[PDB]
Design a binder for this molecule. Sequence first.
Ligand code: CLA
Ligand code: CLA
Ligand code: CLA
Ligand code: CLA
Ligand SMILES: CCCCCCCCCCCCCCCC(=O)OC[C@H](CO[C@H]1O[C@H](CS(=O)(=O)O)[C@@H](O)[C@H](O)[C@H]1O)OC(=O)CCCCCCCCCCCCCCC
Ligand SMILES: CCCCCCCCCCCCCCCC(=O)O[C@H](COC(=O)CCCCCCCCCCCC)CO[C@@H]1O[C@@H](CO)[C@H](O)[C@H](O)[C@@H]1O
Ligand SMILES: CCCCCCCCCCCCCCCC(=O)O[C@H](COC(=O)CCCCCCCCCCCC)CO[C@@H]1O[C@@H](CO)[C@H](O)[C@H](O)[C@@H]1O
Ligand SMILES: CCCCCCCCCCCCCCCC(=O)O[C@H](COC(=O)CCCCCCCCCCCC)CO[C@@H]1O[C@@H](CO)[C@H](O)[C@H](O)[C@@H]1O
Ligand SMILES: CCCCCCCCCCCCCCCC(=O)O[C@H](COC(=O)CCCCCCCCCCCC)CO[C@@H]1O[C@@H](CO)[C@H](O)[C@H](O)[C@@H]1O
Ligand SMILES: CC1=C(/C=C/C(C)=C/C=C/C(C)=C/C=C/C=C(C)/C=C/C=C(C)/C=C/C2=C(C)CCCC2(C)C)C(C)(C)CCC1
Ligand SMILES: CCCCCCCCCCCCO[C@@H]1O[C@H](CO)[C@@H](O[C@H]2O[C@H](CO)[C@@H](O)[C@H](O)[C@H]2O)[C@H](O)[C@H]1O
Lengths: 51, 98, 36, 36, 37, 51, 204, 176, 30, 242
Amino acid sequence: LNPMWRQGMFVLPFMARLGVTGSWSGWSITGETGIDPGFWSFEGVALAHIV
Amino acid sequence: EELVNVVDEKLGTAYGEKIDLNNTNIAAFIQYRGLYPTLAKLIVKNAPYESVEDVLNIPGLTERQKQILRENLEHFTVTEVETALVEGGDRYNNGLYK
Amino acid sequence: MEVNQLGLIATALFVLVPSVFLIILYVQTESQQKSS
Amino acid sequence: MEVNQLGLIATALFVLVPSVFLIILYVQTESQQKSS
Amino acid sequence: MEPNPNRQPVELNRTSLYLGLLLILVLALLFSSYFFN
Amino acid sequence: EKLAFYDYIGNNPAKGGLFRTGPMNKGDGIAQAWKGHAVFRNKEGEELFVR
Amino acid sequence: MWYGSATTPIELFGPTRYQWDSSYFQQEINRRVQASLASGATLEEAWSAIPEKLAFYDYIGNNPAKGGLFRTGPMNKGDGIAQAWKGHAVFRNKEGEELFVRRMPAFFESFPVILTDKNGVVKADIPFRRAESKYSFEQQGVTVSFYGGELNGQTFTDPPTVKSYARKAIFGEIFEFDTETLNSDGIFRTSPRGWFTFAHAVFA
Amino acid sequence: AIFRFLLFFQGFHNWTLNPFHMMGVAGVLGGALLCAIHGATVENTLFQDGEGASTFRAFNPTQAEETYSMVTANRFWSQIFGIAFSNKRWLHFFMLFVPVTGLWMSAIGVVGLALNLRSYDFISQEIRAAEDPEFETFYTKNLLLNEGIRAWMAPQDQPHENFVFPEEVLPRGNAL
Amino acid sequence: METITYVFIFACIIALFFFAIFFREPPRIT
Amino acid sequence: TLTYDDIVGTGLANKCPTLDDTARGAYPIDSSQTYRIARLCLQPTTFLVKEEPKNKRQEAEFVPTKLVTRETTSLDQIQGELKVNSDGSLTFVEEDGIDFQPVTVQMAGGERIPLLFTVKNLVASTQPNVTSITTSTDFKGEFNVPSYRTANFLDPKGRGLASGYDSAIALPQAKEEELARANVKRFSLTKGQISLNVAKVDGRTGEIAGTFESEQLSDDDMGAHEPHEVKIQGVFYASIEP
Ligand code: CLA
Ligand code: CLA
Ligand code: CLA
Ligand code: CLA
Ligand SMILES: CCCCCCCCCCCCCCCC(=O)OC[C@H](CO[C@H]1O[C@H](CS(=O)(=O)O)[C@@H](O)[C@H](O)[C@H]1O)OC(=O)CCCCCCCCCCCCCCC
Ligand SMILES: CCCCCCCCCCCCCCCC(=O)O[C@H](COC(=O)CCCCCCCCCCCC)CO[C@@H]1O[C@@H](CO)[C@H](O)[C@H](O)[C@@H]1O
Ligand SMILES: CCCCCCCCCCCCCCCC(=O)O[C@H](COC(=O)CCCCCCCCCCCC)CO[C@@H]1O[C@@H](CO)[C@H](O)[C@H](O)[C@@H]1O
Ligand SMILES: CCCCCCCCCCCCCCCC(=O)O[C@H](COC(=O)CCCCCCCCCCCC)CO[C@@H]1O[C@@H](CO)[C@H](O)[C@H](O)[C@@H]1O
Ligand SMILES: CCCCCCCCCCCCCCCC(=O)O[C@H](COC(=O)CCCCCCCCCCCC)CO[C@@H]1O[C@@H](CO)[C@H](O)[C@H](O)[C@@H]1O
Ligand SMILES: CC1=C(/C=C/C(C)=C/C=C/C(C)=C/C=C/C=C(C)/C=C/C=C(C)/C=C/C2=C(C)CCCC2(C)C)C(C)(C)CCC1
Ligand SMILES: CCCCCCCCCCCCO[C@@H]1O[C@H](CO)[C@@H](O[C@H]2O[C@H](CO)[C@@H](O)[C@H](O)[C@H]2O)[C@H](O)[C@H]1O
């Protein structure tokens, strides 16, 4: 009931479409119990770009 | 629907007037003649007391210890065991010093 | 009144920023003849 | 957090305003040699 | 590095200054109400 | 619940406004739960439907 | 502006910090109350005579000394918009003895609540380490009665409420504030007398 | 009798959290750095104008050429700190402005504490900590120190006040 | 909203550091 | 064999006693003889925290969490009499030991759930007619979950239960009404449940081993917020003696 699109998320959805679906914080955009993105988590993607 | 601080509330009962056998901390007994050292550890070490006199019935007490206890019963009392005051060994070391 | 809290800034910047862009140019123009 | 609502402006202006005053002078200086 | 050829000066006359401030300030009197909402 | 949620005009991109800034949650609020399907009957027991 | 002066009326600018220091207003109040009694007037009657305006000045909340450099806005953003005088509060213990709350010296952000008798003997107080309270309310059976003001005639014997009222006593006369209108936060802010003085002492 | 004036301030005015005192420090502290970095730069940039090692004499109290090399200095720092002076006249004015200015801000600050118009708290922090008992910042920590400094000090430091704080009132941690 | 305001002024000091070093007016010998 | 300078740092001091695959024995329970438990150890392995209801009553599950502390979780030295009351069933009565450890686990989202992993005042019993404790045996029972923080604990703003401030000292003229919750520190006390299931035995030495699972409550913070539900899955050793 509170998916990313209700929270005015603009860029998050674009990272989801291609595969980035989790956070270093342990949560998943699909809501999966403690999974583990590689480095390529939403934080990683943001990082890469900043660099 | 009122939140209550059990300790401030207990300072309304006999606790806050006399040594509470079920609650007050061991060092309270260092205020009356030969009562602290050995008896205090006994009193405290023996669960709650349904009533003051019950001290008199603690295991293996000497007819002397018993004699004193009777002397100071007028300074004792009893109130519902209060977790906040009993939990954590607080009765042997309530965290206070000088 | 329950106004948008970012309104005071959205309006303030929307004025200063480009408005200053112009002030810079103008003055830097004048000085190409030592003026100011 | 219950911050001061005028903080975002008090800080924004406190930066832009005098900061722009300096940018104006500097650039108007450069142009006294056609620069910019 | 050495001096760069392609390189002109920039310019903006009084009139433009004035017409800009008019455009800015007015766009601001227009949109400010929709920003405060 | 997810399904029911999509069946709510409040998630219709068509509603909304140009200066109604923010996420959809600043509008009708943060969806908490589906109160259930509502059937409206009149005195005769007939089942009515809301337009 | 900081001290007195016929050019700095206290009804245009606020009270002086020195009028609180010497319990200026408090004195005149008693001086009246005590008189009203000589005139044969019920305790209530006597206090109920004290003008609200006067009581108000006898409140640390209007002390220019309280306040802070960045605590912006009018005094009402602090403790709220004064609505009415809840009346004078007398605090008696179990023995009936009348205790007195030690006031807050404009200097202390926070102050303890000590209650002493006539000759300043510590009679009651609110403890920090309950392990050995001797004067805790309850233990002393403190109570509070009100005279004049809007709580006039009422008494409270309930520990919490007595305490609450005692902590608000520290600030001098107890009032009722409206804190919703301006969305106040409960923190004192200085008056014009305060600011004006600050600005001019620094520009100087 | 001064160290006392220091703590009193920390305890009642929470001075160290005042932006004006901070500048005060930044100036006194940085004016010391200038008065020491400059001194060292001059001494280790001296041309040789003597034969021995004690080069103090090599300096003719009489006019002429600079005694150290401003050119060499400007080079050192610029490659070992990116920025470097290069205008003795500006360098020495900065050296006047830095420590002077900071003691001025230091003053304005106190002119403020005269009216107890201090910079005691950050409301945003208080409101949060009042509601949420698990919020703790070095800010709040220091505020408790102050409560302690006032409670225990006040009595003997303000005699005309006849303070009397029963042991049960004295704020204290655990054990200590 | 504050976080952002603090991180900005900071990002500015840091970009201003770059320019002050690598974009000064070279101290030419006169 | 292994000593202190042998274990120090290896963190073996937290893992407790094993039984080489030789077990499956049977420790003869005499009934005409009094038995006690020398050392009962409980080594935590996994902590789960039932996802706070979504409000939408749709069966909340226990999700795994990351251990934010170190290897400071094990319960050891626990002892007490293993009473043999009628109908053959055994009943252990916890007497004393290092029967509690404050653990803090970082949860999936972001939260940090501190609980008081304990088995204080534990009293577990077994199936009736227990003769020679075997891999078929097992204990179950309740225990008291004290309270993460003691009556003495003070909060960042000074307030506390048995000691400390009375209120929001930094907001002198605000409404106390809404701050009540946090100005009055209540001290809870609740029940916890475990169940030690024996997996290995050593008839000879009289030492059983196995897995355990207990469920308890998290820290409510002197009652500032609601406590989370926890479930702990670990291992346990147990040296029984007459
Ligand atoms: C750690 C770093 C630090 C630093 C660098 C500073 C720096 C400063 N502090 Mg701060 N302070 C600190 C920590 C620090 N403080 C802390 C932790 C506290 C406690 C919270 C304080 C509390 C504090 C207080 C309470 C005060 C300062 C003040 C000052 C300023 C000094 C002003 C001055 O010029 O005095 C130098 C001395 C003078 C008063 C100048 C006049 C001196 C005359 C002309 C000399 C006469 C000499 C005579 C000829 C010789 C006779 C001598 C005899 C022995 C023979 C200075 C900016 C002061 C201030 O703010 O002033 C406005 C002040 O009052 N500070
Ligand atoms: C492709 C473009 C784009 C899009 C589609 C979005 C979309 C979104 N943003 Mg993002 N955003 C963008 C770019 C974009 N953003 C950029 C570049 C930034 C950096 C500044 C941001 C920063 C940002 C923030 C900080 C936030 C969002 C949020 C959001 C969401 C809420 C909608 C909203 O904010 O409406 C607001 C829109 C408006 C009212 C703008 C209308 C524009 C006016 C008409 C232009 C001015 C007119 C012009 C001067 C006329 C002159 C004419 C001339 C000829 C004279 C939404 C999903 C919010 C969020 O997180 O959601 C929960 C939020 O908080 N965005
Ligand atoms: C003589 C000076 C003066 C004085 C004493 C007052 C006094 C007052 N004003 Mg008025 N005001 C003034 C001038 C003055 N004002 C001017 C010129 C304006 C036009 C901008 C206003 C606009 C104004 C408004 C819009 C409001 C008030 C309000 C108020 C009242 C609340 C106090 C307050 O706002 O604190 C706030 C004060 C501060 C936190 C400022 C501290 C200043 C910092 C330290 C300066 C920045 C430092 C500097 C950059 C350092 C650089 C150092 C360098 C060497 C490097 C108070 C009675 C309020 C009111 O109506 O009350 C209900 C209100 O809403 N005033
Ligand atoms: C590790 C070393 C260290 C560092 C880096 C700092 C840094 C700082 N101190 Mg601290 N201080 C230290 C040790 C240190 N201190 C110690 C041991 C004490 C005594 C316990 C103090 C006591 C102290 C006091 C009492 C005060 C400060 C203040 C300050 C700030 C301004 C100081 C200033 O202007 O000095 C003079 C100026 C210079 C010589 C220029 C140095 C360049 C700047 C200031 C360093 C910037 C540091 C920043 C964190 C890093 C950004 C770079 C980025 C790439 C990461 C500054 C952030 C003041 C403050 O609170 O300010 C708001 C203040 O009042 N300090
Ligand atoms: C019981 C008692 C026992 C004894 C005492 C205890 C021990 C004391 C030790 C310190 C002696 C160090 C030598 C000083 C000189 C020097 O370095 O030469 C370099 C120059 C010499 O100048 C100059 O001399 C130069 C020539 S030359 O140096 O002879 O070549 C000349 O060219 C130049 O123009 C002229 O200005 O020295 C200075 O100007 C710097 C120092 C003096 C500043 C005084 C400040 C006051 C505080 C003093 C505290 C002293 C501490 C004492 C410790 C106990
Ligand atoms: C409804 C009633 C209300 C009235 C409405 C107000 C509108 C009044 C008329 C103004 C509109 C004409 C401008 C457009 C046509 C034109 O491009 O004109 C410009 C005018 O300059 C100007 O002063 C216009 C400058 C525009 C400012 C925009 C700033 C953009 C930067 C934003 C930064 C963001 C980070 C440039 O003119 C030029 O001026 C000279 C060059 O500087 C030369 O004469 C050029 O040939 C040319 O004539
Ligand atoms: C240093 C140099 C800087 C120079 C820049 C100058 C700045 C001046 C610009 C003024 C901006 C006006 C907007 C005010 C609204 C506001 O204030 O709202 C914001 C919209 O933001 C944003 O999402 C900004 C991005 C806009 C995305 C929409 C794309 C539109 C393209 C249209 C084509 C062009 C015609 C934030 O949305 C917020 O969203 C929520 C918080 O997450 C809450 O609802 C808030 O109350 C709020 O509504
Ligand atoms: C176009 C060119 C403009 C260029 C100017 C650039 C502006 C940058 C300056 C930033 C200002 C910082 C102040 C933020 C506070 C705030 O934000 O507060 C305000 C204080 O205002 C004011 O009363 C401003 C006047 C201050 C009077 C005090 C005199 C101080 C003299 C000290 C000597 C100099 C050292 C308003 O007070 C309000 O008062 C109440 C509403 O009436 C509420 O409590 C509000 O929440 C609020 O606190
Ligand atoms: C986030 C925390 C923020 C911390 C802030 C730290 C501030 C400390 C910087 C020192 C202040 C400069 C004081 C001397 C003034 C001066 O003389 O330097 C000037 C450049 O100034 C500036 O704009 C200096 C900009 C700051 C550069 C930061 C250095 C970064 C270190 C990188 C480490 C490399 C491994 C230019 O030089 C002058 O230029 C002329 C002035 O008319 C004259 O030639 C003068 O003699 C002189 O040469
Ligand atoms: C107003 C508006 C708008 C606009 C806006 C915009 C256009 C924006 C932009 C923005 C941007 C454009 C931003 C950016 C940012 C950036 C950043 C933030 C960056 C950073 C960086 C960094 C941090 C770096 C670093 C480094 C270096 C230098 C070296 C190497 C290493 C490293 C990596 C560390 C619109 C139209 C929409 C609409 C209406 C309104
Ligand atoms: C050389 C420069 C080096 C810079 C290093 C840092 C680079 C990254 C810069 C990120 C800038 C934005 O950083 C982001 O700002 C927004 C506010 O605008 C913060 O958001 C904050 O305010 C919003 C409301 O507006 C709250 O809901 C949120 O809980 C709070 O944390 C984000 O928590 C912060 O991550």
